[PDB]
């Protein structure tokens, strides 16, 4: 359906609002959108091995 918010990215499955560099929803974009890929999990570690003490 059609509604009246205002975004900067548009896909056939809805609109996107993010600043991440990658994207998963649909490979046809209008506006300024992050890059479409074909993966599921791109978690990136900033920290240590969580090793608890016994």
């Amino acid at each position: 359906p059609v509604h009246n918010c205002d975004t900067r990215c548009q896909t056939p499955h809805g609109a996107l609002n993010s600043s991440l560099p990658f994207q998963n929803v649909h490979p046809i974009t209008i506006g300024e959108c992050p890059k479409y890929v074909k993966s599921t999990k791109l978690r990136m570690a900033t920290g240590l091995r969580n090793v608890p003490s016994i």
Partner: protein, 153 residues
């Protein structure tokens, strides 16, 4: 390369330490420890922040791209179009997954090097009067108070 400190000769981490990633644990005449080391963790935070911001800013944003149309007599160009789009899609997803899978061991070995260097510093400026015992501790042949604790730190 695993430098040997995290889950190595040092046992697992500390729950009670809060405000950092690298700290000390003193047991002087009047208290217990769990105080951070704000020098080395600051360089760690700045390095990882520059790392993540660089990885963000290298990937360019894509502009408008709309699928096209063809009649029944231009199947050749349409197959060429589909080959182009799938080839670029495979190259980009390969580069993304490979970049993350190298960056993870890079940052874990970075933390391991930070632990080992912070241990070598404390050992090197306590060259005799320390009596190391195991898993990163020292036992102080002389007497020490909070002043010489911060003098170590």
């Amino acid at each position: 390369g695993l430098f040997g400190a995290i889950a190595g000769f040092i046992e697992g981490g500390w729950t009670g330490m809060i405000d950092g990633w690298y700290g000390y644990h003193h047991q002087n005449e009047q208290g217990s420890g769990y105080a951070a080391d704000q020098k080395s963790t600051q360089n760690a935070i700045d390095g990882i922040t520059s790392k993540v911001n660089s990885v963000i800013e290298k990937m360019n944003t894509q502009f408008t791209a709309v699928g096209k149309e063809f009649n029944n007599l231009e199947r050749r160009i349409e197959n060429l179009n589909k080959k182009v789009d799938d080839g670029f899609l495979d190259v980009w997803t390969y580069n993304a997954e490979l970049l993350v899978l190298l960056e993870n061991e890079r940052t874990l070995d970075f933390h391991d090097s930070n632990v080992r260097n912070l241990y070598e510093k404390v050992k090197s400026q306590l060259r005799n009067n320390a009596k190391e015992i195991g898993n990163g501790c020292f036992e102080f042949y002389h007497k020490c108070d909070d002043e010489c604790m911060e003098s170590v730190k």
